[PDB]
């Protein structure tokens, strides 16, 4: 029923991952809502549920397959399926709990965690911050095992939470920021696995504050600056969208354009 | 009583070339002729004495020659600093200066950079009003300046002043001033000076 | 190191007499001749005469035998030429030149800066100095100007910021309106200043230095 | 909902990293606007309020073009005294500030400090690029392109080499005028020529500040020369050629870049 984008970690090259993220974006937004040359995801208000979600299928080496569910409005993972079991994060409202009811109708059992999908809860469960959790082809291939084997009670919860941290950053956050897509692309080439730098972490914390500053901008100028970080984490202030255009690929809908 | 006929009266050559100045005497001065270089503002500068003996400190590109009543004076490998007025001076009997020869360096043609200035309010208090127009760093010297008030040409009350040729970039300069009374000044609006497509720089008030 | 400093520009009414000095500051004054050369704006160079200090020797042109008189002051190394009963045709620039007459192959050597002698019945009037304020001027650098109008006699020295910077400065020859002089001067400075620029006009004949 | 745009008090940086500045801090009708080094304090001659009526105001007065022809100068002026569309300005996403009536662009036709601003025909030159920010300094990054290797230049030629963060020959200062200048000598610019396909991009001085030295980082990952319409291209996807050419857009990996801050 829902659209599905497939990806494998087995022969994962630079081109195979680039085509994957570019295919995730093409199914996330129509591209008609473009503000300052940065596409915008559809608005949450008037979305039929037949266009509310997309499915991401992760299948690593050793036959293991898992299927994530992503919300079109914010490109975030809302849950996953493994064979006959389905798991979802605790929704932050009653309306979105109804949209979850329409995901994974084939499963035998529906499980809803007591924790949400935000990082502050996931990092506490995993016992590590994002700065101490490595990413790349390696960690993703291991995360697929932790999600799949969790149904049989074979993976620890900290391992599962960290695995959620891996999949969200390499799939969701890479579709939002082509800068993060390039970071993972740098890790797949040279086959290195690295934890994210302060540059990636601060961008993940700012996706909400960046989309508001860009959509609510006077011809691209910000009302109030946004503080970022570099590799060193020495921080710099952004006052205009011009430098963020090669950085942000998707934006959450905050408003409609004015008639102009 | 000896007469020195220096010819020509003026010259015009380019950098690197050589010029020749002829001095014709009324009688045999027996090679006792000198050659001087006079830049405006400076005092004349001795170049050669006794026909060909060059002055200590002068480049070798200057040279003289002649005997009896006919003498010549060369300047090879011309430079921009050679702009002056050259004279011959006999000293066989008393003294006699030549007519002179004003030298011009020929460079590439250049258009003037025009600038115009409204009359100062301090001048308006004195009852007068003079609008100034500059034409700086052009070539050749021949330029027509045309004043315009409300579009109509004005030819009376104009004073022109040409500078000597610059000894470095071989350019000239000009300042034309239009002198009008203050009441006649404020009876009209726009002011314009055109340089002869002409070059135009104007102010409005 | 051979300098002949001549006296400054002299203004004198028609019929009066003027004395032009010429100091030597580089050699033994009594051993060399002092020549006197007249230059009109359209007459080239005329020889007036020569005076030999240490002796009393004088040679006249015969053209100036009733006009010019040369004296000498070996106690001060200054030579003098006195032009008497000045006509309007005496208005010229006069030079003193050194002649080493030790052997007849030498000609006139070092010349002075010249002394401008103006013979007119006009009265000395100071110049009304005006600033030429220009903001709608590019060429990577701005050009200012100063106007020196209605003065007599010549000359007026125009400098900017008391001697700096003449990259730069274009001072134009004065024009005579019979008998009032006017001249203009402009300066080109980079676009960043204006940090302050004013011109200095100096009319020594009227003793007026206008800082505007 | 509906987006309400604000009126942020923001400086305007441009050619050679110089701020849009009211000359000598005088605010009478007619005084021109000049290039000037960016101050660190609160002098209103460099702080501009980006108003909602498409007017750029400092201390109350408005940024106003003297006319609608190239190249008359741009001056400070009263908003209610000047023509209501001689004070109108649009700020484009590619650093272009254009007057809608004249269709002319705010330009700095000279790189020296104190250069009077004018309006010129839009050629997307470095002299015509601007950026509303309070950032006095440009953004210093390495540029990573094909095969994860870094853009690098040694005095003359630019190419791509192994991304060793140590070199500082791979450090680039992204100036507010759209120019890409190496961190070593910030007087040199990433310069293109003739707007012809397969032209080797070189490293020349930012003296002319022409169209060809101005670049824009795009969303698809390309570095576009706005005037020519072509993008930076690693010739034949062969880094061993030491040639970065200017080629039309296709989106292949040789045209994809990323500024790793
Ligand atoms: C984006 C993409 O490749 N989607 C495909 C989908 O079309 C296909 O039906 C499925 C079956 O293997 O695999 C996946």
mmCIF file of C-alpha atoms in Angstrom, chain B residues 110-180:
data_model
loop_
_atom_site.group_PDB
_atom_site.id
_atom_site.type_symbol
_atom_site.label_atom_id
_atom_site.label_comp_id
_atom_site.label_asym_id
_atom_site.label_seq_id
_atom_site.Cartn_x
_atom_site.Cartn_y
_atom_site.Cartn_z
ATOM 1 C CA UNK B 110 44.167 60.321 -23.973
ATOM 2 C CA UNK B 111 40.782 61.809 -23.107
ATOM 3 C CA UNK B 112 40.460 64.335 -20.265
ATOM 4 C CA UNK B 113 38.855 63.485 -16.931
ATOM 5 C CA UNK B 114 36.328 66.303 -16.551
ATOM 6 C CA UNK B 115 35.222 67.759 -13.209
ATOM 7 C CA UNK B 116 32.829 70.633 -12.477
ATOM 8 C CA UNK B 117 32.310 72.615 -9.264
ATOM 9 C CA UNK B 118 29.398 74.872 -8.231
ATOM 10 C CA UNK B 119 30.181 78.344 -6.871
ATOM 11 C CA UNK B 120 30.971 78.326 -3.171
ATOM 12 C CA UNK B 121 28.460 79.939 -0.829
ATOM 13 C CA UNK B 122 31.326 82.106 0.435
ATOM 14 C CA UNK B 123 31.697 83.510 -3.085
ATOM 15 C CA UNK B 124 27.945 84.117 -3.357
ATOM 16 C CA UNK B 125 28.181 86.376 -0.299
ATOM 17 C CA UNK B 126 30.641 88.575 -2.224
ATOM 18 C CA UNK B 127 28.092 89.102 -5.017
ATOM 19 C CA UNK B 128 29.897 86.928 -7.572
ATOM 20 C CA UNK B 129 29.465 83.386 -8.846
ATOM 21 C CA UNK B 130 32.130 81.448 -10.767
ATOM 22 C CA UNK B 131 31.573 77.856 -11.911
ATOM 23 C CA UNK B 132 34.793 75.910 -12.497
ATOM 24 C CA UNK B 133 35.456 73.026 -14.893
ATOM 25 C CA UNK B 134 38.642 70.946 -15.072
ATOM 26 C CA UNK B 135 40.122 68.921 -17.946
ATOM 27 C CA UNK B 136 43.036 66.947 -16.503
ATOM 28 C CA UNK B 137 45.530 64.532 -18.081
ATOM 29 C CA UNK B 138 44.609 64.587 -21.769
ATOM 30 C CA UNK B 139 46.472 64.503 -25.089
ATOM 31 C CA UNK B 140 46.981 66.270 -27.436
ATOM 32 C CA UNK B 141 46.787 69.850 -26.144
ATOM 33 C CA UNK B 142 44.116 70.898 -28.673
ATOM 34 C CA UNK B 143 40.753 70.901 -26.862
ATOM 35 C CA UNK B 144 37.580 72.979 -27.195
ATOM 36 C CA UNK B 145 35.642 73.731 -23.997
ATOM 37 C CA UNK B 146 31.941 74.558 -24.351
ATOM 38 C CA UNK B 147 29.865 76.046 -21.537
ATOM 39 C CA UNK B 148 26.095 75.572 -21.372
ATOM 40 C CA UNK B 149 23.491 77.228 -19.144
ATOM 41 C CA UNK B 150 19.932 75.900 -19.592
ATOM 42 C CA UNK B 151 21.271 74.392 -22.830
ATOM 43 C CA UNK B 152 22.237 77.699 -24.467
ATOM 44 C CA UNK B 153 25.914 78.350 -25.122
ATOM 45 C CA UNK B 154 27.641 81.173 -23.233
ATOM 46 C CA UNK B 155 30.841 82.625 -24.688
ATOM 47 C CA UNK B 156 31.463 85.858 -22.752
ATOM 48 C CA UNK B 157 33.109 85.905 -19.344
ATOM 49 C CA UNK B 158 35.176 82.748 -19.924
ATOM 50 C CA UNK B 159 38.864 82.424 -19.025
ATOM 51 C CA UNK B 160 41.073 79.496 -20.038
ATOM 52 C CA UNK B 161 44.416 78.400 -18.598
ATOM 53 C CA UNK B 162 46.640 75.666 -20.043
ATOM 54 C CA UNK B 163 49.412 73.999 -18.067
ATOM 55 C CA UNK B 164 52.763 72.958 -19.451
ATOM 56 C CA UNK B 165 53.219 69.349 -20.514
ATOM 57 C CA UNK B 166 53.714 66.901 -17.657
ATOM 58 C CA UNK B 167 57.297 65.632 -17.457
ATOM 59 C CA UNK B 168 56.269 62.100 -16.434
ATOM 60 C CA UNK B 169 53.088 60.957 -18.210
ATOM 61 C CA UNK B 170 53.365 63.562 -21.020
ATOM 62 C CA UNK B 171 49.819 64.832 -20.405
ATOM 63 C CA UNK B 172 48.320 68.323 -20.341
ATOM 64 C CA UNK B 173 45.599 69.919 -18.213
ATOM 65 C CA UNK B 174 43.103 72.757 -18.512
ATOM 66 C CA UNK B 175 40.870 74.814 -16.216
ATOM 67 C CA UNK B 176 38.030 76.856 -17.729
ATOM 68 C CA UNK B 177 36.081 79.250 -15.501
ATOM 69 C CA UNK B 178 32.808 81.048 -16.248
ATOM 70 C CA UNK B 179 32.389 84.349 -14.383
ATOM 71 C CA UNK B 180 28.820 85.559 -13.823
#
